[PDB]
Amino acid sequence: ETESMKTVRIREKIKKFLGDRPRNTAEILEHINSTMRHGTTSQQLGNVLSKDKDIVKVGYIKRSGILSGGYDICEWATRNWVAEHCPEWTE
Numbered sequence: 520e521t522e523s524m525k526t527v528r529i530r531e532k533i534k535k536f537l538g539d540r541p542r543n544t545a546e547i548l549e550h551i552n553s554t555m556r557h558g559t560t561s562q563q564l565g566n567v568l569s570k571d572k573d574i575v576k577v578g579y580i581k582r583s584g585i586l587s588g589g590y591d592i593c594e595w596a597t598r599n600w601v602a603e604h605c606p607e608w609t610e
């Protein structure tokens with residue numbers, strides 16, 4: 520019922536989802552929100568992903584344009600996935 524309990528539940532779902540390969544924030548949000556009653560927002564999810572040390576940011580695209588407006592897309596992986604697939608990587 521608590522916000523922490525929800526956040527813990529969300530973290531476990533995200534980690535399972537990211538098991539196979541890295542995914543972008545939009546894909547993660549769609550997955551999470553497809554399997555929870557209320558789910559979360561892209562802003563809140565970004566915070567959760569950043570705060571969870573088991574889930575690491577592996578890429579980014581930022582777009583800006585006089586027509587595009589601006590947006591970012593971030594790519595995330597589990598730390599263990601990175602350790603296994605990029606064994607020269609460190610942070």
Ligand SMILES: [Cl-]
Nearest residue numbers: 555556557558
């Ligand atoms: Cl929920």
